[PDB]
Every structure is written in structure tokens, then in C-alpha cells.
Design a binder for this molecule. Structure first.
Ligand code: HEM
Ligand code: HEM
Ligand SMILES: [Ca+2]
Ligand SMILES: [Ca+2]
Ligand SMILES: [K+]
Ligand SMILES: [K+]
Lengths: 267, 267
């Protein structure tokens, strides 16, 4: 639609190159964009989502954001090469590139986000979800963001990608057997495995009885326990196409929360 | 040592009769005495533990105290027959009677507690432990009460008795196979069973893979996950005698927190 002030074709290629050199960056880029959005409260209309406010104290120091300096620093290099893109647009674009890179949907990108210029616009601590909690908490957080149950379940499906790091969250390991692949595997394993206590990790997490190599957090398995969420887990477990479409729509919504004056990018 | 102002022999007999008529009262009596003590903060020296302050608003309405009106009302009948005993002494005595009734230790009773006369002395909400949380929370609560890890594990062993009620905590069912029996079965099952997610209860709890009839809360299994607590789980699983002795000592300590001027009862 409207040509951006940065060379988006070249930037996308450079993001792809960066990911290719360090594949675990892909899932961290998705996590970064999600936590930059997750500050929103749709009722108070505050939290400066999608403004790269996480670059500043106090938000950069929130426990839920531990480890996100890694994708932020990776992207800094590209910001220097493409100075016309805002950090906010860059983090969103990099997440969209990562999602596609790993086999997920190609989400239509809109540009135009303006960066937070200091930490005074940061939302408070306590807005990020807690993996040790279950559906009452998950629903409260996602309702606060403005998402319904279908969108909530679709979004949490992103745990098909990546892994937990003891240093960052105290949890350990990948959810799925192919942590650098995007698909509906998070949902299939939620339904298909027997989730047993993992006695080897001090922070309570479950593992699959079959191999012990898959993990789930309390916040993941609450999608099985809650009657509404479980219906969508079942839906996505059976249909990867539907999951991809719904994830695309929900993630686009997430990364456009609290934004204005965006422009459709050339594609 | 010192004869109380109430007929303790007759009162004990009446508590035993009451339990015999409704055996599930036994574990609720233990829970009542424990929650009446659990308000203590040993650093602030507040919370009016062991004063029967739970009789009053706001404490009676704290979420963690749901269902405790049942043992309170049961004991009211005995308070009327033995008006010289304080509610505070009565709740403690009834718990000691219940522990012995179910095969646990006979704990030496001291009398002399004075009742709270109104709710202004109630400690704040948020002092009771949360079954959905794990060892960081459990340790913080028990440290606040003044207990070490050994005592913490011994006390939680009381879950050998009784059961969860959906109406009260949202959890469902007994921990052990014999919910009206007191012994070290909570610890044996913690070590011996495979604890798998129970998909049938909306509040996350585990069940044993073998029968699915045993349950554990996140707060129970955190005793397995924490290196220090696990040592005591192992200790008590192997030695019911040691568990009984340690439970007796810890429970006596618990029910004497924040008390003064007590007298050894005739035994
Ligand atoms: C109930 C909601 C959620 C909870 C409790 C939660 C929790 C967590 C935790 C504890 C980690 C581990 C961080 C680490 O140790 O590195 C993590 C990682 C991750 N999260 Fe979530 N999250 C939630 C929702 C989401 C959503 C909505 C998205 C994106 C749409 C997402 C994307 C990711 C990704 C991709 C990773 C892997 C990061 C990496 O490999 O470096 N999460 N999440
Ligand atoms: C981490 C610490 C603890 C947690 C999280 C916890 C939590 C719970 C919960 C959720 C229930 C179910 C209540 C219901 O639904 O009726 C319960 C019941 C019970 N608790 Fe605990 N508790 C803890 C420690 C203790 C201690 C220290 C004692 C006594 C020494 C104790 C004695 C009992 C008993 C006997 C029951 C059964 C009540 C009945 O059958 O009516 N608990 N506890
Ligand atoms: Ca933010
Ligand atoms: Ca109290
Ligand atoms: K995957
Ligand atoms: K028992």
C-alpha cells in the first residue's frame, strides 16, 4: 500500500540472515514482540503497547522480561543499518519474519509505530502472565488485553516454538519435539500425552510420560482443564490450517494494540 | 499439672463422641486449629494466633477459611456444655483429640488461651498458604510462622487426613487412600506414585497414575521438588514413628504460637 521510509525488502532479508545464523533467535523474537504488546490494558487504554518501551527501565527489568535483552540487542544491529525503522516496527516485523521462517503464517505487516522515547510511559509491573498460574489468571490477563478465549488459545500456541531457560524463567526445556518449527504441535501434545510431574526441575512443570522430553507449564495445561479453552485446543489439534489462520489474525491484533496511523506494507 | 476450670476428661469424651458420629469432622477440626494459628507473623509478632479470632469478621470470610464454619459450629455445642473453656483452647483441644482419634500422636495439651473478643485483633488476609503455589510460597509462609523445613514438612503431612471440597477450595477429593486415618501415607504416596495431571478437575491438581483416586496439590508436590523438603519427605516416608513424634512437636508449637501463661493439663 504505502512504501515505508526503510528498505523493507532488504531489512526482511537481513532479519532472515540473522535468524539463519542463530536459529534460537526466532522464538525469542516472537517472545519479544509479544511482551512489548502484553503491557496493554484495554479498559484503561494504557501500558504503551507496541512502542518498544521495553528498551527502558523499569520495564526492561520486570521479571517476566528476563532474557529479552538478547533479541533486543540482536535487533540493535539492524536498527543501525536501517535507522528509519522504529524499534517498535522492527520488533514486530522481526517477529513476523520469525513466524514465517519457522513455517507459520505470513502475517500482513503494517508499519508506522512510534517509539517510546523514555521509560515514563512504561506500564506497571504485574501485567505479564505467570506460567505457574492457571486459567483464572490466564483469562484475566487476556481479557485485559482484549482477547476472547479463541484468540487466547491460538496465541499460546506460539509455545510450539522455542524453549524455557532456567536463567530467565526458572523453567527448563522445549515444549515440543521440534522447537524451531511452527505448527499445531503444542495442541496435539497437550491432548495426546500423559502429563506427569517432572521431579528434576525445581519449578513445577510437567513432562510427557512417553519420552520425558516434552514439557508443559501449569499455564499451558490449564487450557486442557478449562472447558472453554479445551474446545479450542481440540479445534487446533485437528486443523493446522485453522490454527495458522487464527494465530495470524490474533498475532496481528496483538501487535497492533494501542496503535494508530499505521500503513499497509508492500508485500 | 494444673486442673483446668472445665471438666477436661468429660469434654474429651464428648469431643470423641462428636467425632464418632461424623468422622469427617476429625480432619476439619485439625484444619480449624491450624488456620487459627496460621495468621501469625513471628517477625511482627501479630496476627493473634490461637485466640479463636476466626469467629469474627473479617477473618471468618477469608477465602482460605471457607468451610471452617462447620467445625466451629460443631464445637459451639460443646462450648455451651463446657462454658469455662475458651474457644481458643477448645479448638486446640479438639484438634489434639482428633489427631489421636485417627491414630496419630497424643500431644500434651496446655490450657489457658484467652479468646479474641472482637474482629479488630484479626490479622490481615493473605497469610494463609495457597495450594496452587509451590515451595517459594510455602517456605515464605512457614518461615513467617517461625518453622524450619523439617517442621514444615511434618506439618503438611496432616494431609494424610481429610479431603478437599469443591465448595471450599475448588479442589476435590482425599489425598490418601484412608482419609480418616493418620499416618505417614502422604509421604509414601508422594514418593511412590506417578503424579499425573487430573484432567477432570478445573483447579489443577494431580492424581496417581495407578488408581487416579489419590490426589496432590501443587503445594504438596513442591515438597518433592525442593531439595531440602524432599529429604524430610524421604525421612517420614521411611519412619512413621519419627513422623508421629515430629508432627506432635510441630503441631504443639503451632498451637502455642503467640500464647502466654499456659498450664499443663492433667493427662
Ligand atoms: C498464559 C500465557 C503465557 C505464559 C504464562 C507464558 C510463559 C512463558 C515462559 C515462562 C517462557 C520461558 C521464557 C524463558 O525461560 O526463556 C515463555 C517463552 C516463550 N513464549 Fe510464552 N507465555 C505465554 C504466552 C505467550 C504468547 C501469547 C506468546 C506469543 C504469541 C508467547 C511466546 C513465547 C515464545 C515464542 C517463547 C520461547 C522463547 C525462546 O525460545 O527464547 N508466549 N513463555
Ligand atoms: C502449604 C501448606 C498448606 C496448604 C497449601 C494447604 C491447603 C489445603 C487445602 C486447599 C485444603 C482443602 C480445604 C477444603 O477444600 O476443604 C486443605 C485441607 C486440609 N488441611 Fe491443609 N494446607 C496446608 C497446610 C496444612 C497444615 C500445616 C495442616 C495441619 C497441620 C493442614 C491440615 C489440613 C487438613 C486436616 C485438611 C482436611 C480438611 C477436611 O477434611 O475437612 N494443612 N489444606
Ligand atoms: Ca510494552
Ligand atoms: Ca488467627
Ligand atoms: K514446534
Ligand atoms: K490417611
Amino acid at each position: 500500500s504505502e512504501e515505508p521510509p526503510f528498505d523493507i525488502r532488504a531489512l526482511r532479508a537481513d532479519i532472515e540472515d540473522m535468524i539463519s545464523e542463530k536459529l534460537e533467535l526466532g522464538p525469542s523474537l516472537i517472545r519479544l514482540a509479544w511482551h512489548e504488546a502484553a503491557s496493554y490494558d484495554c479498559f484503561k487504554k494504557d501500558g504503551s503497547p507496541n512502542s518498544a518501551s521495553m528498551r527502558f527501565k523499569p520495564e526492561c527489568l520486570y521479571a517476566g522480561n528476563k532474557g529479552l535483552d538478547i533479541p533486543r540487542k540482536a535487533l540493535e544491529t539492524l536498527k543501525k543499518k536501517y535507522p528509519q525503522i522504529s524499534y517498535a516496527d522492527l520488533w514486530v516485523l522481526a517477529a513476523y519474519v520469525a513466524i514465517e521462517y519457522m513455517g507459520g503464517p505470513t502475517i500482513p505487516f503494517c508499519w508506522g509505530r512510534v517509539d517510546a522515547k523514555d521509560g515514563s510511559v512504561c506500564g506497571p509491573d504485574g501485567r505479564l502472565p505467570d506460567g505457574s498460574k492457571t486459567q483464572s489468571h490466564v483469562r484475566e490477563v487476556f481479557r485485559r488485553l482484549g482477547f476472547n478465549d479463541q484468540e487466547t488459545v491460538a496465541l499460546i500456541g506460539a509455545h510450539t516454538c522455542g524453549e524455557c531457560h532456567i536463567e530467565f524463567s526458572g523453567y527448563h526445556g522445549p515444549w515440543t519435539h521440534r522447537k524451531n518449527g511452527f505448527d499445531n504441535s503444542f495442541f496435539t501434545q497437550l491432548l495426546d500425552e500423559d502429563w506427569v510431574l517432572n521431579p528434576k526441575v525445581e519449578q513445577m512443570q510437567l513432562m510427557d510420560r512417553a519420552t520425558t522430553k516434552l514439557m508443559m507449564l501449569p499455564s499451558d495445561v490449564c487450557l486442557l482443564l478449562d472447558p472453554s479453552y479445551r474446545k479450542y485446543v481440540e479445534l487446533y489439534a485437528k486443523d493446522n490450517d485453522r490454527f495458522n489462520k487464527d494465530f495470524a489474525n490474533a498475532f496481528k491484533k496483538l501487535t497492533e494494540l494501542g496503535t494508530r496511523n499505521l500503513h499497509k506494507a508492500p508485500a
